[PDB]
Every structure is written in C-alpha cells, then in structure tokens.
Design a protein around this ligand. Structure first.
Ligand SMILES: [Cl-]
Ligand SMILES: [Mg+2]
Lengths: 144, 106, 144, 146, 144, 38, 144, 38, 37, 53
RNA sequence: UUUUUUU
RNA sequence: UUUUUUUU
RNA sequence: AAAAAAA
RNA sequence: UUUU
RNA sequence: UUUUUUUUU
RNA sequence: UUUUU
RNA sequence: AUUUUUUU
RNA sequence: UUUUUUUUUUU
RNA sequence: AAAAAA
RNA sequence: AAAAAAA
RNA sequence: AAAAAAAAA
RNA sequence: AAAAAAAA
RNA sequence: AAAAA
RNA sequence: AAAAA
RNA sequence: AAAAAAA
C-alpha cells in the first residue's frame, strides 16, 4: 500500500486503443402478443441506456428470458426462444414454464463458438413466444 | 434522493451523531407492485466528490415477493457524510422501499 | 466443443445493471506551452471517442505522460507532472527526460487508495510541463 | 433399477424446461448424379427430406463430407472422385481426390470442416463440388440439424 | 484444431441408416374432465411439432404429468396416472398433489424394462385424472 | 481493495432492530464529602 | 439373465400363505367442521379402493395429516392430532400450522411399539381439528 | 425403544398411491386328468 | 452474554401444548392384615 | 430493543425472536409481563421456551 | 462422533 | 462475550 | 423419547 | 453434442 | 437383490 | 475469455 | 513490508 | 502407431 | 445368466 | 448408462 | 425404496 | 472491522 | 488486490 | 547495528 | 496448427 503519490518509471509509449471491446450482460424488455412470435432486434442492445451507443456490431453468446408480466387467468407462465442466425434460422423452441402462477417462467440458450459472429442492429437475435404481454431478456454478448 | 439525515434519529439511538461513513446500502420493496407486474428496485450511488451513474437493479421472480438489491462502497470512497448530503437514488414501481444501510457512525 | 445451440436451465430473475463501471486506460493529447503549466481537465475523459460520454464521474488511479512532438533545437525532451486533488493539490513535479533527442520523455505517478475518490468534469487531475508543444497522456481510471 | 418387474412411482418436482424441436447430430447417406468432365454442386436441400426424418429442419451445420463412387468407372479406367468445399463467405479451390487401386473397388475421399467454418446452411446453399469418371457418387455427410 | 479444411482418408463404404432411432422427451398437453378419466393416445407423440411425424411406433420409458391450469376454488391441485398396457391394463393411481394452491401438482411412473415394448397411434399410454382442466405431460420415450 | 462500487446479491428481508444494545464503560465524576458516603 | 425359460429343481412343497400381511400408506380424506373435533374411524382403511377390503384388523404405526382445502379468510391453515387407544385415549394435540396462507398445514405422530396393537373397523384412530373443512391423511400401518 | 407417542415433523404432501402393486406367491389347486394337459 | 440477543426465527414450527411427560409418582395406600388391596 | 422481522412474501408470516441471558433468567409470576408485541397483523402466535417451577 | 436441562 | 461482515 | 442443533 |  | 412403508445424503 | 499496473 | 535515495 | 516449413499465444 | 456333465 | 455421431 | 416373494445353483 | 472494561 | 456472466 | 515516520 | 507417408 501507500499513503502518497509515488513516481512510475514509465518506458516507451505503449500500444493503446481508445475504443476497446466490452463483454456485457444487457437487460431489456420486449412486448409480446398472445399467439404471435416476436423477433428480438439486435438494435435494442445498442443504446445510451446501456453505454453501447458507440458500437455498431456485437457477438452474441447466450440469451436468457423471463416473463415480465402476469399470465392470463388460470394459466401458468411460459416463454419460448427460437434462435435466429443470418446464415440460417433454427427451429428450436427452448421453452420454460413456471410451476407457480405467481412466479416467472425462465428459459435460455447458448450460442456455440462456431456460430459466434458479429451482428449489426438490423439483425434479429431470436423469436420469443409467451402468454404474458411482456418478456424480460438478459443477453450475454461481446460488443466490438 | 435518500437523505443522510434519516440515519441520525433517536429511533436509532443516533441523534447524538452528525456524520457517518456509509459502507454498503441494501434495499427492499416495502409494498406490493402495480397490477400484473413484479416488484423492482434500483439504486444509484451518490458521492460529494462525484455522483455515479450505476443503476443496480433487483427484480422479484414472484409478484407477492419483495425485490432486493444492494451495493458496497469501496474503501477509497468511504468518507463521511453529513445530514444535508444524500446517499443514493431509489427507483421502484412500489410506493415504499425499505433500506438497510451498513455504516459507521462517528 | 458444442456446435449447436444449447438450452440453459435458467432460474429466478437475477440482479442486473444496465450501466456498470469500466476500468479503462484512456489515451489523449494536450497542447503545452513553454514555461507555463497546463491543468489537465477531467472532462477530457468523458467523450464518445472513448465510449465514455455516458459517465459523469471517474476514479483516477494512475497517470502517465509522454512528449508528443519534437523538442526545441539542441534540447532533450522532458515532461513534468504535478498531481492535483480537490482536498489539496500536491507540489511534486515528477519529471522524466529523454537520453536521446529523437526519443520521447516519459514520467508518471500512482494515486494511493486513500486518495482515490471520484472526480467530475469540472475537476483537474494534474499539471503538465514540457519543452515540447504537445504531451501524450495515458490515464488508468475507473469510470463510474 | 433394471431389476424391477412392475411400474414404480417417480417423485417428480417442478415442471422442467422443454423443447419440442431439439437439434440432431446425424450422418446422412444419399447419392448424386455426375457427368464426365463436369463438376456437380451438391445442394444442402438434399438433407431436408422426409426420407431422413429431417423435413422439419430449415438449417444445418455441416462438419465433414465423405464421398464414394456409386457406379462402375469407364472401361480400362480406375475410379476416382474429387471434392471442392464451398462456403458462402468464400469458396475454396482444394481438390481432395481419392482413386481406387482396383477397378472393381470404389474410390473414397473426404474432408473435415474446421470449427471456425462451421456455420449454418440452408437448402439454397451448396456444400461442395463433386467430380468423377463414374456417373453416380454416394455421399455420407456428418452434420448437426438445428 | 485447424482454421482450414483437412482431407479425410476414408476407406470402404460404411454401414448407413437414413432413418435411425431417437430418444426424446416429448412435451404435450391434454384436456381432462372433472371426475372422468382421459386416455392419453400414443398418437399424440407422432407429430410434426415434435419432428416425429416420420415414426409410427415408440417405446415409452417414463410418463410424468403436471397440472397445466389452476384448480377449482378452495382446492389444492392433484393429478393421477393409471398406466395402460396392451398386454394388461393396470390399476395403480400414482397420485401427486400440490401443497400450494398456486403451484402445480406433479407425479410420474417408470415402466420396467420387461414392459418396454412398442406402441402405435391407436394405443393409449395411460389414464389421467385431475381437478384441473388441462394436464401437461413430458413422456420420455424411444422413437423407432 | 476495490476501487468501484459493486453490486450485492441480496435476498429476503433480514431480521432487524432499530434500537440495539451497547457494551460501554462510562467515564463520569461525582462530588464526595469528608467522612460521608455518596 | 437368459432369453428363454429355465427349469427349476423344486423340492418339497413349501410353507404357503394365501392371505399374507401388507404394510401400506393409505391416503384418505375426512371432513372436518369448524371448532369441532372429528374421530378418524379405522374402517376407512379397509376398502376396495385400497385393496384392503379382505382385511379386518390393522396395526397402525404412524399418522400424518394435511389440510385438504383452503383455510378461512385472513387465517393460516392449522391441523391438530390427538391419538386414541382402546387401552386409553391420549390428550396430546400435535399441531402443525402453515407459514403461507396458500400452503397446507401438516403434522404427524408416531405410535410406539408397546402401543401397536390391532384395531378393528369399529375403533378410532385419532381426532382431527382444523379451521379447514377437509383434512387429508396418510396412515402408515400393517394390515393383518 | 419408546413408551409413548412422538411427534413427526412432516412436510409437503408426498406422492401417494392407494392401489399399489404386490409381489406374491399364489397357492392354488387345479384338477388334472390322465394323459391330458390342463 | 449479559444481554438479550436476536433469534433469526424461520417458519412456524410444529407445536404441542400438551406433551406426554415421564414421571415417578409417589403416593401411599392403606393396607389391611391378610387382605390384598 | 425492538427485534423486528418482516415477511418477504405477503402470503408468508413474519418471524423474530429473542434469547434471554442466564443472568436475566429470574422467575416471573402471573402479574408480570414478558415483552411487548407490535405488528400490522391483528394477531400474533408466541412460542416461549421457558422453565416452569 | 460433538453435546448440554428435572425422571 | 455485545453490533456490523466475507464465494451455496 | 423431550429444551436449543443434528452438517 | 440434444433431451426429462 | 426386487415390490410398498420409513429412514439418511 | 474481456479491460487494466 | 509507509515514504526518499542506493540497488540485478 | 513416429518427423521437414508461415505465422503463432505460453508454460 | 442357454443344453450336458468329478 | 441407452441411442445418434468422427478415427 | 419397511414386508411378502425366485435365487447367488 | 468496531470507541469502551479487561489481559505474562 | 481490482473489473465484467 | 542505511535515513524519516 | 497446416503438406509425403507409415500397420
Ligand atoms: Cl462475461
Ligand atoms: Mg422466487
């Protein structure tokens, strides 16, 4: 430790980078209608509300989802996630249901390394299906 | 903006103090959330040397259950605060929030 | 390793933070005059050029300096640093010179933990003195 | 366990996660028609069919391609087969060739796709180019349907 | 591994199978009337929604069920399962009840190895009794 | 040791007490007279 | 083992019993009235719905009780159990309450070996008090 | 061992089955004739 | 500990207001000569 | 002291307790008071581990 | 395999 | 040994 | 087999 | 590597 | 070792 | 892994 | 092993 | 079941 | 763990 | 541990 | 997975 | 970690 | 001894 | 049993 | 890591 300023015997000018990368977990919500599949846009990840308005591309690694609102009467919450890729969309429907009507329904999926390419704002991450009118998403990604 | 003057009170046996060194702040939603929603609560640490922009959020996975979140003030930022100062900003859909603040009165 | 998407058995909604902290090494340059000391504003750290226009405060940890232009004729490059603090400025003039006229001068200082508080744009971090007309600065800091 | 002779109760817990349309790692055998001196582009759509239980998929990640000469070679000749991998980011120029050392025996060759080049492909895309002196080439492709 | 394609020294043509088996966990819901037992048809397992519309026979391993809707007023959820077999229907009522009215009731039964034969769409897996109007089943089976 | 604020994954609301106990030793003086017990 | 039938070198005729004993857990529900205790009849165990209609006596080993329906408004469920014996009734009130209004209240007691005599259908097991109007029971006993 | 009743700290309602299975050895007689199978 | 402490109680536990209690009871009886009581 | 406990679920009970040190474990007769109870619920259940004599 | 409170 | 702490 | 744990 |  | 009841990670 | 002496 | 010299 | 060259992080 | 046997 | 999958 | 039930043949 | 009372 | 799932 | 604390 | 080969 130290209680005062001390000198740093610096050397040659190093290698710098003013705009580095940033591995993040981005939370946001999306509105979803009953029976309709909603495509989650990558553009929602680029925002000043996430300190990411300086990025134009991102490498998505894994996506998790939670039901943000209450389900219809008598029903338990559920949520489905169909991954989407520019080289070819998937037909998986990773679904998670709540065992309590008062609790959220959670599910997610991980993108393999071979499918971890950049995605711009115009692309889509996945489709979401749910009986609740809003879904909360947390996306672990690598902004670059 | 949560005032620091709320820590100094006879209800806490702390009416004899004028300053306090806050260490960590934790928050719980004290009332039920609006209809069809789950409880959430946010905290933005404030400092007289510079306020922060963090929004430490905690949401409940149950409409009947409280939401909870907290932050720890690093030692380098653990200075004193008087009553006129503020600790942090709270945001929530619930109309009351319970705070448990670990601090050192002096 | 896995070559396709993998389901994640997610649980309760976790704790999140859309605007976290960021430990960075911010490089920039400042113009310096002869014999006159230049107070480096903290506001230079908050810019879109460093992905930092969303922060308002920052905890500086260490400062380093290099001479960015060539020194006067027949001279060797030097650069001084004087730490400034809102509670009280220092009188230390950490100085490093160049043993080659074609080579930069370098010097830095480390801020102790007890003196690591937040600084806003209206604050100053240190003074800079050099015989060159520009000085390159790299500041290790914790944006919050 | 494995010694029971009747039904037993399962103390199930909360409702789990589910996925009615999961992935599937497969080896898909099929054949293509080839002409002499010309290269045939193998379509990815040959993998999405009810004959392979895969007519429900719309994308696939190819890993390795293996080819055998399905018909006899021309007279006085030995069988051969070539493969040129194709990628949407950029086609290759390799010619992985294998020749039969017996006129009565097939000619086999194959190539493995690196992990960095294992993205998804759709029916409109192509896998590789096939060249052979035989008229028909049987292919076995390892891939991951998703 | 590598960043490029590598030749495979293949040998003789191997043993192939264009229509292999598949071990699956099939999630589907049924409608249950009050005090009336519903026979779960095996044909609910062969569907394009499960990618299994190419199978005609399946060997069921374990059947577990969850209440999909809320119970009547003042009641806790329950669900019963009576295993059915073509060589002899059973009389067990594997019942599971919910200790919380807002929570599902779950129960399951395992089929011994000596009773794991194939079943076609005309066959029934088991009966289901419950106070709820829908039951979610996750049947672990082997499609062939 | 850390230089920034860090999140605290808090759970259920704890048991609290706004008026706790305190172990002290109090310094204070008294006036004494000669040949008299105070 | 093998795949075909095998011969058994059986010996003398063994000691047989066509009507053996059977230790079980019998789930059955009872109706309770407010502020009124209800004696549980032993004849509820002997039933064709429990495969025990062939028995006439039973040795009870333990009793367990759950509240089968919801409690009155503003209240948490509770259930009490007072053991009864032909040699002398007890005065213990093994009471179990619920910490969640939606959750069942449970309690149980164990009968010592010295008090494990037979009981016929005319006898009584215990008394059940509860603010709920129905109480589920799971009695561990030995039918003989 | 004990001499009186003991309290059982029960929990959630378990998985129950009022009609379980039963492994048995059933002894019964049949009538058989000479040179003919029954 | 010379002062009251806080007990972090959880859910409501199983209770029994009337337990069993094991005892050794002393008492006297009157006996006559030759007669069993 | 006001040893307080709060329920994190509206449907769940709130609980708290306090232990008496051996030095303060004297006897108390019927006219005495054990403690004061405050709550927003109109009824509280008490479990008191004590030694009758 | 922790132990401490009257028959 | 009284009040706050630290990776289920 | 009765008080506060049982890891 | 995919499942409950 | 298996079928149902109870214990314990 | 990513960003920092 | 806090600071300032000297230190491979 | 055993190697020569184009770059190449780390012990 | 089939069918025969110091 | 069963099934599908590369030498 | 307590009893009842073939035996390590 | 915590001012107070102690303490080879 | 610091960060971001 | 180099300096200052 | 990538190019002959070897039973
Ligand atoms: Cl991360
Ligand atoms: Mg919860």
């Amino acid at each position: 430790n130290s209680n005062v300023v001390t000198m740093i015997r610096a050397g040659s000018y190093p290698k710098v980078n003013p705009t580095p990368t940033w591995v993040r977990a981005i939370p946001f919500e999306v509105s979803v209608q009953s029976g309709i599949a909603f495509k989650v846009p990558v553009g929602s990840l680029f925002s000043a509300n996430f300190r990411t308005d300086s990025f134009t591309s991102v490498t998505v690694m894994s996506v998790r989802a939670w039901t943000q609102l209450t389900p219809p009467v008598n029903e338990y919450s559920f949520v489905r996630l169909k991954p989407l890729f520019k080289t070819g969309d998937s037909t998986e429907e990773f679904e998670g249901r709540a065992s309590n009507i008062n609790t959220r329904a959670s599910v997610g999926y991980r993108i393999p390394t071979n499918l971890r390419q950049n995605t711009v704002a115009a692309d889509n991450v996945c489709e979401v299906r749910s009986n609740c009118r809003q879904v909360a998403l947390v996306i672990s990604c690598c902004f670059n | 903006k949560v005032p620091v003057g709320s820590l100094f009170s006879a209800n806490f046996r702390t009416d004899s103090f004028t300053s306090v060194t806050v260490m960590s702040v934790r928050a719980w939603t004290q009332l039920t959330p609006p209809v069809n929603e789950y409880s959430f609560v946010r905290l933005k640490p404030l400092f007289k040397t510079g306020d922060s922009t963090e929004e430490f959020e905690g949401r409940a996975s149950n409409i009947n259950t409280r939401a909870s979140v907290g932050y720890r003030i690093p030692s380098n930022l653990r200075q004193n605060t008087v009553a006129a100062d503020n600790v942090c900003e709270v945001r929530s859909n619930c109309r009351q929030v319970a705070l448990v603040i670990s601090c050192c009165f002096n």
